[PDB]
A = this chain, B = another copy of it.
Amino acid sequence: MIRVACVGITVMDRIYYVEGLPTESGKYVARNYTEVGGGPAATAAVAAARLGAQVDFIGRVGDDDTGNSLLAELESWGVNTRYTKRYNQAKSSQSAIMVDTKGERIIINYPSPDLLPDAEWLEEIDFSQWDVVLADVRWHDGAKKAFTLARQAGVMTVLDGDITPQDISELVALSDHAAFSEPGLARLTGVKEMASALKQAQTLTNGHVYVTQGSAGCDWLENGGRQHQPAFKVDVVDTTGAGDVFHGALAVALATSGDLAESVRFASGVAALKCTRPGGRAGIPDCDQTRSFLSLFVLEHH
């Protein structure tokens, strides 16, 4: 089967369901609240595990109750946490998330400063044991080190190019597949027009560049041409982690088939189904539920 490493952040999601996204200063009341594990690499690992892969998550937690809950949750999804570092006297990372009734979200992330950025401890891990290494940009040194070791071992690298304060140029160069979010690509290039931004991103790597655009689907460059995969329409409750699940599914599909069109289509299906349930994980389908959704899509109007 497919052996996956996911390198990046694991954070506790504190999700507030509101009438509307709070645009202005004031007091608001949440209609509902859920506390669930998140973080791009960690949710991507859960997607890979749901889809049949043998999955390692490699990141950093504190020794607070949050840390032990984050890792226990990943283990219950079939994600192995043996390579995750526990810092002592450390808070784990967490986010406040506001989701409106259309499933659009504001995420405020607080990276715990007790989790050191040092990635040298990754050098003790044998990266040659995996078919694919996924990394998020939210642990910059972990992504740089993991992709360097993965390229040296001849293992495919897949980047979750989300928005982040630092420049991710050097992570993109180490990426076989650099799958940006719309905001991620805009921050990296400083260009708001997606088509021109994607051509600029392509100059940063010999790998493939993609950009996800929520319900507008996914664009990528292949044979010097602009490719496209529409989103699948579903009853959306929560788009939180759509990107994370898309990246997990894309890494599994790319490692399985090598086929960009079929892999992006597969990942779009998995991400669409995730959007139908609250949080990053409850809606994640297995391989069989995904193939039913994708193969019966053409037998009905949707």
Contact = CB atoms under 8 A, between A and B. Distances in A.
Interface in A15-40: 16, 18, 21-30, 32-33
Interface in A105-162: 105-111, 162
Contact of A22 (B14, B108, B162, B183): B108
Given A14-B14, A22-B22, A24-B21, A30 B110 contact: yes
A75 interface: no
B110 A163 contact: no
Given A14-B96, A22-B22, A96-B16, A109 B29 contact: yes
A33 B162 CA distance: 22
A165 interface: yes
B16 A107 contact: no
Contacts of A21: 22, 24-25
A83 to B, nearest CB: 25
**What are the 6 tightest A-B residue pairs by CB atom distance, in nearest-first order?**
A96-B96, A33-B110, A30-B110, A16-B108, A25-B104, A22-B106
15 contacts: A18-B108, A23-B23, A23-B24, A25-B106, A26-B163, A26-B183, A27-B163, A27-B183, A28-B106, A28-B108, A28-B109, A29-B164, A29-B165, A32-B110, A96-B96
